[PDB]
Amino acid sequence: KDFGGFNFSQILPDPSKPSKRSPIEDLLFNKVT
Amino acid sequence: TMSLGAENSVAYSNNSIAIPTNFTISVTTEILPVSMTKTSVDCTMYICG
Numbered sequence: 001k002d003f004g005g006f007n008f009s010q011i012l013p014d015p016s017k018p019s020k021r022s023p024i025e026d027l028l029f030n031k032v033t
Numbered sequence: 034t035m036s037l038g039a040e041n042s043v044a045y046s047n048n049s050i051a052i053p054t055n056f057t058i059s060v061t062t063e064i065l066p067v068s069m070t071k072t073s074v075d076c077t078m079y080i081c082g
């Protein structure tokens with residue numbers, strides 16, 4: 001992830017999560033009931 | 034289970050670029066409805082004749 005100093009971890013999919021969602025997407029899915 | 038698309042991994046690196054050397058003139062069709070059939074119903078004739 002060498003993008004010239006730009007960080008996209010919050011929007012790229014998280015390998016740790018089984019759903020393969022981003023942290024922002026995971027937060028969005030959690031906040032909808 | 035459906036396949037979303039063919040897999041393509043873009044070869045990203047910090048110092049390489051891809052430049053097109055040719056072009057294709059592509060003509061595509063787009064169909065859009067504009068109007069419907071103009072229908073009028075005589076309410077008295079329809080319900081009672």
Ligand SMILES: *[C@@H]1O[C@H](CO)[C@@H](O[C@@H]2O[C@H](CO)[C@@H](O)[C@H](O)[C@H]2NC(C)=O)[C@H](O)[C@H]1NC(C)=O
Nearest residue numbers: 001002003005006007008009010011014016023
């Ligand atoms: C990009 O951003 C992520 C998250 O904002 C950074 O990950 C953090 O790294 C620090 C240092 O190890 C940890 O203490 C945090 O817990 C991490 N956050 C998360 C959410 O895991 C990451 O270091 C940044 N830089 C790069 C190059 O990825």
Ligand SMILES: *[C@@H]1O[C@H](CO)[C@@H](O[C@@H]2O[C@H](CO)[C@@H](O)[C@H](O)[C@H]2NC(C)=O)[C@H](O)[C@H]1NC(C)=O
Nearest residue numbers: 040041042043044045046049050051052053054
């Ligand atoms: C530009 O160079 C890259 C890396 O040398 C090429 O990417 C490779 O393409 C082949 C053919 O599909 C793949 O088998 C490799 O896995 C690719 N490498 C990576 C790191 O993704 C790329 O095809 C080249 N561009 C052109 C137009 O030839």
Ligand SMILES: *[C@@H]1O[C@H](CO)[C@@H](O[C@@H]2O[C@H](CO)[C@@H](O)[C@H](O)[C@H]2NC(C)=O)[C@H](O)[C@H]1NC(C)=O
Nearest residue numbers: 050051052053054055056057058059060061062
């Ligand atoms: C760019 O692409 C066009 C395709 O449209 C190439 O034109 C073809 O060239 C070959 C070789 O001379 C001919 O056999 C074909 O009949 C041509 N096709 C058409 C539609 O004319 C063109 O040569 C390409 N140019 C480069 C620089 O790659």
